[PDB]
Design a protein around this ligand. Structure first.
Ligand SMILES: Nc1ncnc2c1ncn2[C@@H]1O[C@H](COP(=O)(O)OP(=O)(O)OP(=O)(O)O)[C@@H](O)[C@H]1O
Ligand SMILES: Nc1ncnc2c1ncn2[C@@H]1O[C@H](COP(=O)(O)OP(=O)(O)O)[C@@H](O)[C@H]1O
Lengths: 536, 48, 149, 100
């Protein structure tokens, strides 16, 4: 009796009559798996597990398609796949029980359920009707919600069945779209070039990361196919796709565009001139990343390891941030994990977790820095070792997190020239296992920490102090005689002395009136001592 | 057309912008254009 | 006329009223004070000349429009024998800064010896008992952001 | 369009309004701090007028100073000037009853 349950929700074979839905691309093996499980008699009704937008319901749709055709065997022949409209159906229980009567009438109605966890209300007669049988259905939820479901293993694990449905390949998605690019280009009365499709996929998997394939790319195709239409009242290209991505995420279209194979040229300039000192160090790392990233090498591993050695507090973190800005930009690609906190062999628990795992989960397009790795322990050490092997860590859910374009840079002090060139390997092979060393991409070591470079940093720092004032208001200028007077200072933290000599003294003198706003405040050594003047 | 069955019940922004009461919005051309695009779309027509 | 001059001072005033922090053009009875704050302290706390110097220096630089960083005004660790002033200096400072020294946030860190007592600085995680009244410290700073913890 | 004036305690604020995060934005906060001792004395005198008229006794000025300072010192579980006027009205009722 079609009336009632058709008033509940529309049938999928009704749509498949004219095949309104686009024919799904690929998934033939996964749909074959669905046919396998639906063929069984004990645990016959499956549940499709996957992230949202991966096209789990597309698999049920292609299933209804293969049902209309003959690909389906005979036992599953004559099976109408339907769904459930919770809205259109005191009395809803009456209508739903009527639906169950019709399910009992004809035992050939494979039902479909999206968001199965929040559905089983209806469970009151569905879960019972499952036990009795002949409610064979399909389920579409996430992973964690499938865990929430199997926590009802008592009466529900026996019947259901898992079918992991995952992202199509960044390659496969191209054929997906090329197959279904027809429908949208018809709708919008435009045409979509295939280079535009591949570019949309290549910017979706990289620069958005919030949603999943192929949802990302399909949305981009449709946003372009509406933008170009409104632009006319013809052909969509890479330009429009870069523009709509730039509108989405907020990055400049130019940085989306040119940086594919030419930013590597600017990178070494940035490294060479963003930190002062560590001359051969920037040469080393710059050479290194050009070997890995530009090179056709290390496909499985991440960009690779960089254990920074020498005195801690000379520019390691600053080199790291400069490199982050270089290769990925934003100065926000760098994630930091303070391994001094992991001085406990249980601390890895918070990894398995509000730590690097969630960080790389949020953005697989980033740099990662481990400082005070010496403070780690052999267990977290083996953890990061198998990571450096493949990046694949699995914490708190077995999440096979990928390390595609991350950077692994470890920082510590085993040093604490050539004699140092030897002692570094000495205390490495002496402080932990040699295999972890052997997963080298490159090892960056700077020994000297004091030079004229140091004074330059102070100059830079003085500039920063001027910056923040040109920000709010003032016109400070440190005469290089005074800069040298300050720099004549042992210990590295000279900014503290900057604060003392300049910031304090100036604030004391400004409070009492010897300075007012809108004045060019030149600080200079006139007799071997700080002197303030205003020029305005 | 011209149905007083809803304007009786809703608040028309556009009829207000007729007599120029709404305060002008500065910038946000990207987001307005994106609302427009999404408004001219078939997979996900409704914007939020 | 002249009154149509909503200027930096008036935004400064509505801020310093909104948030307790005093961002405005300080005047007399303040600059004289900030300069003489070393003498006020060295009145309340006898001896220990060096400390009051550094505390007054930090409060001045912060109050003189310097202290560009987004990091806190100061950060001091007072060490020494018992009964020297390590607490008396802080009480004097909060009193001279505000008055009555009772706006001072006082946290007896000698009470958080346990591992789990670290809850009542940041609260108790959502859902768990005591979630609403959370933040024995945090709520005190969101109440009065310009104070001496 | 509608002008409002809200009034919640710090506790209900953090627990309820802060939780909403949108209606909160609509309103404008204004911290009202507890009076110091002296301000409390002046408040207490202004109200002393009415409390005298209601109990039909006369409340000494130093009586009020003592109420303020005592209740600042030996109650320390509720705030001023509620504390002080509570003491004042207690004493008023007590004295009127002592008339009988
Ligand atoms: N330099 C000082 N000048 C004036 N009073 C002082 C001084 N040092 C200590 N005191 C007196 O000590 C008492 C409080 O001292 P304070 O509590 O600061 O010592 P403390 O170092 O905090 O002690 P504890 O070691 O128990 O922390 C007050 O009575 C204060 O007058
Ligand atoms: N293999 C595929 N072939 C063709 N289209 C696909 C494929 N996978 C996903 N899609 C597209 O994804 C869109 C909807 O995805 P959907 O299944 O609703 O996501 P979810 O599984 O999160 O509900 C459909 O327009 C569908 O065409």
């Amino acid at each position: 009796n079609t009336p009632t349950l058709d008033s509940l929700a529309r049938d999928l074979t009704a749509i498949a009559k004219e095949d309104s839905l686009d024919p799904v691309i690929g998934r033939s093996k996964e749909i074959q798996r669905v046919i396998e499980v639906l063929s069984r008699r004990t645990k016959n009704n499956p549940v499709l597990i996957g992230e949202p937008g991966v096209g789990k319901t597309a698999i049920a749709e292609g299933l209804a398609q293969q049902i209309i055709n003959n690909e389906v065997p005979e036992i599953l022949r004559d099976k109408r796949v339907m769904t459930l409209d919770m809205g259109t159906v005191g009395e809803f229980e009456d209508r739903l029980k009527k639906v169950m009567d019709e399910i009992r009438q004809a035992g050939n109605i494979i039902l479909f359920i999206d968001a199965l966890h929040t559905l089983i209300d209806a469970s009151n007669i569905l879960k019972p009707s499952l036990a009795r049988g002949e409610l064979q259905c399909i389920g579409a939820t996430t992973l964690d919600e499938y865990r929430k479901y199997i926590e009802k293993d008592a009466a529900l694990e026996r019947r259901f069945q898992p079918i992991q449905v995952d992202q199509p390949s960044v390659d496969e998605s191209i054929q997906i779209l090329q197959g279904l690019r027809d429908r949208y280009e018809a709708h919008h009365r435009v045409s979509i070039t295939d280079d535009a499709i591949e570019a949309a996929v290549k910017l979706s998997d990289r620069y958005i990361s919030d949603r999943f394939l192929p949802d990302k790319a399909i949305d981009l195709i449709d946003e372009a196919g509406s933008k170009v239409r409104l632009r006319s009242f013809s052909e969509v290209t890479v330009d429009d796709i870069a523009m709509v991505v730039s509108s989405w995420t907020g990055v400049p279209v130019s940085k989306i565009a040119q940086t594919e194979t030419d930013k590597l040229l600017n990178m070494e300039n940035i490294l060479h001139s963003r930190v002062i000192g560590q001359d051969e160090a920037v040469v080393a790392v710059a050479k290194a990343v050009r070997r890995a990233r530009a090179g056709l090498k290390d496909p499985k591993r991440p960009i690779g390891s960089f254990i920074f050695l020498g005195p801690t507090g000379v520019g390691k973190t600053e080199l790291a941030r400069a490199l982050a800005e270089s290769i990925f930009g934003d100065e926000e690609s760098m994630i930091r994990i303070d391994m001094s906190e992991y001085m406990e062999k249980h601390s890895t628990s918070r990894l398995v977790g509000g730590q690097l795992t969630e960080k790389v989960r949020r953005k697989p397009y980033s740099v990662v820095l481990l400082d005070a790795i010496e403070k780690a322990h052999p267990d977290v050490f083996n953890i990061l070792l198998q990571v450096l092997e493949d990046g694949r860590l699995t914490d708190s859910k077995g999440r096979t997190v990928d390390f595609r374009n991350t950077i692994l840079i470890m920082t510590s002090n085993v040093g604490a020239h050539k004699d140092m060139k030897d002692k570094v390997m000495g205390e490495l092979k002496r402080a932990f296992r040699p295999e972890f060393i052997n997963r080298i991409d490159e090892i960056i070591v700077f020994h000297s920490l004091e030079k004229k470079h140091l004074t330059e940093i102070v100059s830079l720092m003085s500039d920063q102090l001027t910056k923040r004032l040109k920000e709010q208001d003032l016109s400070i200028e440190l005469t290089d005689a005074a800069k040298a007077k300050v720099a004549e200072e042992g210990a590295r933290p000279l900014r503290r002395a900057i604060q003392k000599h300049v910031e304090d003294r100036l604030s004391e003198e400004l409070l009492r009136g010897n300075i007012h706003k809108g004045q060019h405040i030149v600080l200079d050594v006139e007799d071997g001592e700080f002197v303030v003047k205003t020029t305005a | 057309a011209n149905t007083p069955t809803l304007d009786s019940l809703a608040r028309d922004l556009t009829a207000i912008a007729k007599e120029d009461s709404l305060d002008p919005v500065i910038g946000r051309s990207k987001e307005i254009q994106r609302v427009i695009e999404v408004l001219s779309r078939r997979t996900k027509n409704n914007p939020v | 006329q002249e009154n149509s001059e909503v200027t930096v001072d008036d935004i400064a005033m509505v801020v310093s009223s909104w948030t307790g922090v005093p961002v405005s053009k300080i005047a007399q009875t303040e600059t004289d004070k900030l300069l003489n704050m070393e003498n006020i302290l060295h009145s309340r706390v006898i001896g220990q000349d060096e400390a009051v110097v550094a505390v007054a220096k930090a409060v001045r630089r912060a109050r003189a429009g310097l202290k560009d960083p987004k990091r806190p005004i100061g950060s001091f660790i007072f060490l020494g024998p018992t009964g020297v002033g390590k607490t008396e200096l802080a009480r004097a400072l909060a009193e001279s800064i505000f008055g009555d020294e009772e706006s001072m946030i006082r946290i007896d860190m000698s009470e958080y010896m346990e591992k789990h007592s670290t809850s009542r600085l940041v609260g108790s995680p959502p859902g768990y008992v005591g979630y609403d009244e959370g933040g024995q410290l945090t709520e005190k700073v969101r109440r009065k952001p310009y104070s001496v913890v």
